[PDB]
Amino acid sequence: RFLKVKNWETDVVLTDTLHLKSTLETGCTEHICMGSIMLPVRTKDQLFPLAKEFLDQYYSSIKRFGSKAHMDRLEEVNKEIESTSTYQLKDTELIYGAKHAWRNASRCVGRIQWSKLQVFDARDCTTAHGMFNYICNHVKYATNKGNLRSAITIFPQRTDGKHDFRVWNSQLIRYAGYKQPDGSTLGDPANVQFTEICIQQGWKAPRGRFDVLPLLLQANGNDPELFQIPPELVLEVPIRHPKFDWFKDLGLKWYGLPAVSNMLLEIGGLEFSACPFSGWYMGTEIGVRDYCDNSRYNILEEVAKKMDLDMRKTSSLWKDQALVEINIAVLYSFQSDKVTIVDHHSATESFIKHMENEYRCRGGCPADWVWIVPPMSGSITPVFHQEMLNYRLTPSFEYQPDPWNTHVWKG
Amino acid sequence: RFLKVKNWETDVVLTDTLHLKSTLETGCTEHICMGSIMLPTKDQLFPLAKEFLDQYYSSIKRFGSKAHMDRLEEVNKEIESTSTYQLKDTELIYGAKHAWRNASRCVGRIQWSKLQVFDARDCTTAHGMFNYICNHVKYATNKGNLRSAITIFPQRTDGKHDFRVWNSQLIRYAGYKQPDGSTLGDPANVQFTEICIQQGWKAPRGRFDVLPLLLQANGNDPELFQIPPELVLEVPIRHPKFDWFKDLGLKWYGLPAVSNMLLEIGGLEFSACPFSGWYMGTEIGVRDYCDNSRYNILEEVAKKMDLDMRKTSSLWKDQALVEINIAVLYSFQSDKVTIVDHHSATESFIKHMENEYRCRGGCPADWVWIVPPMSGSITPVFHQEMLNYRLTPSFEYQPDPWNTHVW
Numbered sequence: 138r139f140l141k142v143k144n145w146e147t148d149v150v151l152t153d154t155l156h157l158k159s160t161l162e163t164g165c166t167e168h169i170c171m172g173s174i175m176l177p178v179r180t181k182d183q184l185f186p187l188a189k190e191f192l193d194q195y196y197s198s199i200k201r202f203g204s205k206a207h208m209d210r211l212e213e214v215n216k217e218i219e220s221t222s223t224y225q226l227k228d229t230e231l232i233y234g235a236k237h238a239w240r241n242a243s244r245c246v247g248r249i250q251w252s253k254l255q256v257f258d259a260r261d262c263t264t265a266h267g268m269f270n271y272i273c274n275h276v277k278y279a280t281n282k283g284n285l286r287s288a289i290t291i292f293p294q295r296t297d298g299k300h301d302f303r304v305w306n307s308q309l310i311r312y313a314g315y316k317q318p319d320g321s322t323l324g325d326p327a328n329v330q331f332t333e334i335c336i337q338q339g340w341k342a343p344r345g346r347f348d349v350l351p352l353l354l355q356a357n358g359n360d361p362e363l364f365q366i367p368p369e370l371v372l373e374v375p376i377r378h379p380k381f382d383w384f385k386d387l388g389l390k391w392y393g394l395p396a397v398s399n400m401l402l403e404i405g406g407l408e409f410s411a412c413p414f415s416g417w418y419m420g421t422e423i424g425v426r427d428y429c430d431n432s433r434y435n436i437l438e439e440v441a442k443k444m445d446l447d448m449r450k451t452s453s454l455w456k457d458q459a460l461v462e463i464n465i466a467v468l469y470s471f472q473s474d475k476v477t478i479v480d481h482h483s484a485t486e487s488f489i490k491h492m493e494n495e496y497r498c499r500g501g502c503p504a505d506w507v508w509i510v511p512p513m514s515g516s517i518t519p520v521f522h523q524e525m526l527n528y529r530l531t532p533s534f535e536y537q538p539d540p541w542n543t544h545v546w547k548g
Numbered sequence: 549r550f551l552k553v554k555n556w557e558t559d560v561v562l563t564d565t566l567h568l569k570s571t572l573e574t575g576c577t578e579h580i581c582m583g584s585i586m587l588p589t590k591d592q593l594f595p596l597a598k599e600f601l602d603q604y605y606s607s608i609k610r611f612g613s614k615a616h617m618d619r620l621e622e623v624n625k626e627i628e629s630t631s632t633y634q635l636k637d638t639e640l641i642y643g644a645k646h647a648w649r650n651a652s653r654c655v656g657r658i659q660w661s662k663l664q665v666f667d668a669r670d671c672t673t674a675h676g677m678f679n680y681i682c683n684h685v686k687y688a689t690n691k692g693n694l695r696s697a698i699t700i701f702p703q704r705t706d707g708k709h710d711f712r713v714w715n716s717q718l719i720r721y722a723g724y725k726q727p728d729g730s731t732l733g734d735p736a737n738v739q740f741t742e743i744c745i746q747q748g749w750k751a752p753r754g755r756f757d758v759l760p761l762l763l764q765a766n767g768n769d770p771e772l773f774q775i776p777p778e779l780v781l782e783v784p785i786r787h788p789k790f791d792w793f794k795d796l797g798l799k800w801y802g803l804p805a806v807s808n809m810l811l812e813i814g815g816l817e818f819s820a821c822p823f824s825g826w827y828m829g830t831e832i833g834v835r836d837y838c839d840n841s842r843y844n845i846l847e848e849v850a851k852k853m854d855l856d857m858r859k860t861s862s863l864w865k866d867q868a869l870v871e872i873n874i875a876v877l878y879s880f881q882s883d884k885v886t887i888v889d890h891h892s893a894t895e896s897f898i899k900h901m902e903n904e905y906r907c908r909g910g911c912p913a914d915w916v917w918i919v920p921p922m923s924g925s926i927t928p929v930f931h932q933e934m935l936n937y938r939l940t941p942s943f944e945y946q947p948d949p950w951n952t953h954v955w
């Protein structure tokens with residue numbers, strides 16, 4: 138079965154065969170589309186074909202499919218599964234797996250970079266202190282004084298689901314949020330619940346608007362432990378505007394390194410529940426979502442006031458106007474401080490070329506339009522006009538439940 | 549089987565039961581989502597009639613009534629005899645309002661019950677069609693106080709006697725391909741503008757020439773008609789801050805009147821059912837004005853603003869896009885032509901969703917189309933999970949008639 142996608146701006150038509158390799162379910166049926174829904178202990182029984190599928194992919198990629206090395210490896214894994222009920226990935230397979238999970242991430246606009254990913258093997262890690270050490274090294278390497286480098290650090294895979302390694306933070310670097318008695322929120326409202334946990338765990342909160350959260354790290358299924366990232370490792374950028382000088386006095390800054398730490402990495406049926414990864418920011422992540430979402434820092438009004446816009450009618454588009462200036466400021470501040478960032482025009486144009494390249498070399502590129510299209514200025518980016526096919530390939534990054542809801546407390 | 553949708557900005561969760569009524573296919577499968585794809589007999593007919601009449605009669609609290617059963621019986625006999633059937637005026641109006649109600653891609657559906665339905669099933673000629681359309685246009689325009697309307701021409705019979713309006717909208721601007729290689733006017737309509745000229749039209753060859761109607765009655769060849777200019781309300785576009793904006797020479801028409809869709813009610817097909825509401829500002833300022841394959845004016849506007857167009861990172865395109873859209877709203881408001889901004893309209897749609905979930909058990913919605921083409925996440929719909937599914941009665945796309953027409 139062949140499937141066609143059309144760019145309605147260029148009339149470029151692409152053919153997808155890659156979707157045939159898809160196994161996992163989408164959430165959709167012939168009767169309903171769940172394309173806009175945010176989120177729609179494994180036996181030896183199910184595990185071997187998953188290993189086999191992966192190793193078949195891996196060995197094809199290296200042009201050794203059906204080789205003796207291929208065959209012996211399958212043999213080795215089968216035996217190791219039935220003997221030990223799981224198996225260990227070679228370093229080569231781990232690196233291949235991590236890169237392909239990123240490559241397969243249909244919601245990621247930055248995938249043109251997928252083959253440049255620094256993989257840190259942390260499978261020899263046993264304690265939370267060991268995790269802190271690995272994470273510091275990741276942050277230092279990835280930050281690279283502003284010249285960001287994509288990286289991922291991979292802790293030991295799940296075994297019985299009772300000894301999971303987990304990073305309790307959603308991102309390695311993130312600002313605290315504090316609910317006040319008056320109902321107002323100080324800092325990042327997105328992080329109130331997690332901040333509360335940290336505090337309960339013993340964190341002494343400065344209670345400021347931009348307090349970098351401590352790391353809450355769980356090794357081998359034990360209770361999580363608190364650590365503070367050395368501040369000298371946390372690269373931050375003061376936000377100013379190139380024309381508006383009052384903008385600095387808004388008191389805004391952000392961190393340079395976006396590093397998602399709550400996802401699960403699946404490779405050949407193995408589950409890596411702690412696999413923090415990092416790239417660099419697209420400007421709108423901060424300027425549109427982090428700053429301007431009503432449920433986040435929500436600075437639209439204060440900015441618009443300071444710009445003296447007509448705020449009595451939405452049809453003045455005062456919100457749209459303030460939104461643009463803020464995003465200009467975010468990009469200006471990062472570029473000025475030589476911290477890697479990409480605007481949403483550059484990023485989406487790159488994605489289209491990547492996607493076209495993927496269709497030719499790979500036979501497809503799964504993509505989630507709802508997520509690929511930037512949260513401002515949608516149709517003046519080329520992805521808006523691009524038809525996309527969303528489907529699930531493995532290796533993959535998956536959501537997992539927040540550890541505080543599942544964790545069995547030792548005390 | 550009972551689905552939940554969540555708004556992530558408000559944490560409001562709605563439960564959808566309405567989707568279980570759905571009958572037509574989405575194009576998606578368990579293995580692949582096609583949510584961003586633009587286009588995914590007697591025995592056939594009675595269950596369709598029946599499904600429709602059941603909902604009609606349920607809607608008026610007469611489910612399982614004699615009148616219900618009688619009507620079911622009557623239509624059943626008429627199909628058996630005639631191989632088709634005719635809708636009662638009441639059913640036609642209900643059906644049209646509900647096709648709109650069910651249009652999962654329409655953000656303006658809070659207005660769905662206030663639709664003026666013009667029954668043009670007695671029409672036999674293109675001149676007749678012209679007359680009805682002029683009347684529609686005048687009524688809907690209402691000197692700038694726009695009112696939603698649909699005019700419904702005779703239903704398909706054997707596919708050989710189709711009523712079709714060839715224009716994609718009642719009112720649209722011409723598109724000419726220059727020797728210069730460029731495109732003057734609206735590039736979207738270059739092909740249609742040709743077919744007009746091929747049929748006899750005389751183009752002023754301007755940037756903004758109101759296209760003539762090409763009307764097909766009873767399967768016959770289509771004929772040209774010029775809409776009386778006095779019926780076409782247009783808005784010259786100015787900016788409430790930039791005095792130079794007027795010199796761009798931009799204008800747009802007030803009446804968005806889609807004419808190429810197919811209205812399906814109770815299995816019956818209305819191939820000619822032009823309808824109109826009023827504009828959301830971004831349709832014109834973002835899509836019509838700033839799409840690359842359209843009027844594509846971003847560059848010229850940016851220059852006039854003297855922005856640093858060297859690097860994408862100055863967000864000069866974004867800056868201009870806003871101002872352009874400010875001007876569109878400003879112009880329509882100034883001249884008292886109905887228009888709604890994307891903030892007001894999406895806020896309205898959230899309220900409408902609430903109502904539909906509460907009173908109907910759900911509201912089919914296509915997020916990809918509902919979220920405006922600018923400033924997406926500062927409108928509430930971006931944060932709103934939506935379920936997309938197909939209910940009938942419906943508006944459907946249909947082939948362009950020149951690819952079909954047996955001349």
Ligand code: HEM
Binds near residue numbers: 239245247415
């Ligand atoms: C190098 C620069 C990168 C850029 C500019 C970029 C850009 C983005 C953006 C804007 C999103 C949407 C996230 C949101 O709005 O919440 C996203 C999602 C995602 N990215 Fe990338 N990314 C980059 C690197 C990476 C890397 C290194 C990985 C993993 C190895 C990755 C994996 C993912 C995944 C799994 C998602 C989906 C997240 C979710 O569903 O919550 N990305 N990316």
Ligand code: HEM
Binds near residue numbers: 698
């Ligand atoms: C009265 C104010 C109305 C507003 C503000 C409005 C708004 C919109 C917008 C912005 C779109 C997206 C169209 C595009 O981007 O091309 C749309 C689509 C649509 N509208 Fe509405 N509309 C209104 C009235 C109506 C009426 C009266 C009908 C029919 C009786 C209707 C039926 C539809 C349908 C079927 C679509 C999907 C069209 C397609 O799939 O191409 N709308 N609407």
Ligand SMILES: Nc1ccc2ccc(CNCCCc3cncc(F)c3)cc2n1
Binds near residue numbers: 176397417422
């Ligand atoms: N620049 C980058 C690179 C990779 C990224 C990978 C992931 C992300 C953020 N994903 C956040 C999802 C937040 C969320 C909140 N509520 C419900 C959800 F399902 C998801 C941002 C990224 N930014």
Ligand SMILES: Nc1ccc2ccc(CNCCCc3cncc(F)c3)cc2n1
Binds near residue numbers: 804806825826827945
């Ligand atoms: N303000 C309104 C009201 C109702 C509307 C109903 C429909 C429309 C426009 N739909 C046209 C879609 C254009 C298109 C072009 N190529 C392929 C497509 F599937 C669709 C605009 C409306 N605007």
Ligand SMILES: C[C@H](O)[C@H](O)[C@H]1CNc2nc(N)[nH]c(=O)c2N1
Binds near residue numbers: 172174507556931
């Ligand atoms: C309801 C909807 O799916 C949700 O708001 C999505 C929309 N698209 C998105 N796109 C990106 N990149 N990130 C997001 O968080 C979201 N949120």
Ligand SMILES: C[C@H](O)[C@H](O)[C@H]1CNc2nc(N)[nH]c(=O)c2N1
Binds near residue numbers: 145523584
């Ligand atoms: C490729 C994609 O499906 C296409 O560009 C869609 C996106 N969303 C849209 N949304 C609206 N309202 N109108 C459109 O024409 C489109 N086009």
Ligand SMILES: [Zn+2]
Binds near residue numbers: 165170172580581582
């Ligand atoms: Zn789908």
